[PDB]
Swiss-Prot record, chain B:
Protein's name according to its UniProt entry: 3C-like proteinase nsp5
Record gene name: rep
Activation and inhibition: Inhibited by pyridone-containing alpha-ketoamides compounds 13a and 13b. In turn, alpha-ketoamide 13b (tert-butyl (1-((S)-1-(((S)-4-(benzylamino)-3,4-dioxo-1-((S)-2-oxopyrrolidin-3-yl)butan-2-yl)amino)-3-cyclopropyl-1-oxopropan-2-yl)-2-oxo-1,2-dihydropyridin-3-yl)carbamate) inhibits SARS-CoV-2 replication in human lung cells. Inhibited ex vivo by michael acceptor inhibitor N3. Inhibited ex vivo by compound 11a and 11b.
UniProt organism field: Severe acute respiratory syndrome coronavirus 2
Consequence when changing P132H: In strain: Omicron/BA.1, Omicron/BA.2, Omicron/BA.2.12.1, Omicron/BA.2.75, Omicron/BA.4, Omicron/BA.5, Omicron/BQ.1.1, Omicron/XBB.1.5, Omicron/EG.5.1
Compartments, record wording: Host cytoplasm; Host Golgi apparatus; Host nucleus
Length: 303, 305
């Protein structure tokens, strides 16, 4: 029993983190085979970062301009190219710790594990969710650029995130491993805002099922709602609409607890309209929305 | 910026997790150098666990009764001994991935990363706080016994926890790496209840220092207090009393902010006696008590290992 924000074991990724320095700029890189991936703004100086013409800045660079260190050993750069906001630094040595990996673009509402690194050295691991406005609520300080987010399926690491920026509001933004930002963000040194931060409804419902599986039911009620009437109320509160696909994804949690999805929706509607008073759900005073249905199934199946 | 429950990178521990099996009973063990550590109840059958005599049950076992596997590779057991509730098995191979490590016994309020493991395979990592009642609010399923909790310092992994038990309330109990349980629990198949829990005062204060570091300081008041007077008051609100070590580990955050420890105790005292008055701290109206001073420091300054 029990339910906790849980990340994947990061050992397979820890063996891929390196340090990338260009001039006075340093951040993290991801070393897979004989390629090191890192945010392209490492080639920038403090002045270039205000408005960088990356294609212009990149052509004026040589291989020896890039200092790549894997722990103690320094890796010799024998080529370099750009794929959107990701610099690809070819090296004369293939990482012997390269695991089975793939590059994927995660969907909003989905979760992944982040391996926060500084100076190429892992520092901490935690789980994040790709929010509807394509930001993530992480913990990133100066020098965390180049940190990656990932999921693991058996023996395959699916890389989905590389960190680039912290918005003025304190949330964070980044790209997939092909260098495409999540959201309307750009890698220039400017204050940038995201779209309205809507709540991942299917995740909140999954988290309510987890609370019930762990013996908490004070928020349940005998009322019921139609899918449309629930979505009417949810959208009023800046919640994402619940699709029939979401209803289907919640099936296992419904079968395990015996609470129909539309029954849980009636509970959430009451919570949204009445609040939680001073009560808590799984120790939280707010409705948690960064647990996916699968995150709940993996921790609550058989409980 | 940002504040999260953050676990340590677990690569150094993942390379040490193995599976230990006796008969049909299987759990996790910790492979360090040429010794594997694991809960002693692996030697029990399902019925043995109801009322085991581990000394008697162990006398009937030999080295050849122990199946130790790293993945699918068997590690031949060449020696066995019992230390409290932990079984120590000498194997013929020294773990090449053994990291710098030490065995430590933590205090209530200290946090550590748990590497949840099943059949010797790491499955998840999350941060836990040792409650004052010597339980942890973990997430453990069948086959999780032998999972360890740890901290990482000078490239050294300090092992502090090995999983054994789930309580009826849904919390969890275990031992240190010397087999000594945290709290008054025993490795037996019975429903055992933990004492009444309390809030970890030192961690709440650390969380208040965190808010002040971030410019959120409305709660800072003009009063101070003695350590003794605060402890007597805090206990009336189900808060644990502070020790001299607690005051000392709060030192760095006290110097960083310029707020004396006993001054912030007086501020917390007012929050307990008067409430928040519809206000929040770091975005929450709930006082957080599972962030140690180091966690606040390690996360407000990005220390690596
Ligand atoms: C990377 O480590 C840079 O190498 C760093 C990310 C963080 C810094 C602190 N916490 C983090 O997560 N990223 C940046 O500094 C980026 C660099 C861009 C992509 C070139 N810049 C920002 O994240 C950024 C800039 C500004 C800004 O300007 C002016 C105004 C307000 C917020 C802001 N964030
Ligand atoms: C280990 O994996 C066993 O090897 C397992 C712990 C969990 C199983 C699911 N989630 C967990 O955390 N541990 C046990 O099953 C222990 C075995 C002891 C140490 C011999 N037993 C319990 O945790 C336990 C027993 C009982 C009980 O009796 C019957 C009544 C109520 C609760 C309870 N928990």
């Amino acid at each position: 029993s029990g339910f906790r924000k849980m990340a994947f074991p990061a050992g397979k990724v820890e063996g891929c983190m390196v340090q990338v320095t260009c001039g006075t700029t340093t951040l993290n890189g991801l070393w897979l085979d004989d390629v090191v991936y890192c945010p392209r703004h490492v080639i920038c100086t403090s002045e270039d970062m205000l408005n960088p013409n990356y294609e212009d800045l990149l052509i004026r660079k040589s291989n020896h301009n890039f200092l790549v260190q894997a722990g103690n050993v320094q890796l010799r750069v024998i080529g370099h190219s750009m794929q959107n906001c990701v610099l690809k630094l070819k090296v004369d040595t293939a990482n012997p710790k390269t695991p089975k990996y793939k590059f994927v673009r995660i969907q909003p509402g989905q979760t992944f594990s982040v391996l926060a690194c500084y100076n190429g050295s892992p520092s901490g691991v935690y789980q994040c969710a790709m929010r509807p406005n394509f930001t993530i609520k992480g913990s990133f300080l100066n020098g965390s650029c180049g940190s990656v987010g990932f999921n693991i399926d058996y023996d395959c690491v699916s890389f989905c995130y590389m960190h680039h920026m912290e918005l003025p509001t304190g949330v964070h933004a980044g790209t997939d491993l092909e260098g495409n930002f999540y959201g309307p963000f750009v890698d220039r040194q400017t204050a940038q805002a995201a779209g309205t931060d809507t709540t991942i409804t299917v995740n909140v419902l999954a988290w309510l099922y987890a609370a019930v599986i762990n013996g908490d039911r004070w928020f349940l009620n005998r009322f019921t709602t139609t899918l449309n009437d629930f979505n009417l109320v949810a959208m009023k509160y800046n919640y994402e609409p619940l699709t029939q696909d979401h209803v289907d994804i919640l099936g296992p949690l419904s079968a395990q607890t015996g609470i129909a999805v539309l029954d849980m929706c009636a509970s959430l509607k009451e919570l949204l309209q009445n609040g939680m008073n001073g009560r808590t759900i799984l120790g939280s005073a707010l409705l948690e929305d960064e647990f996916t249905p699968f995150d709940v199934v993996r921790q609550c199946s058989g409980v």
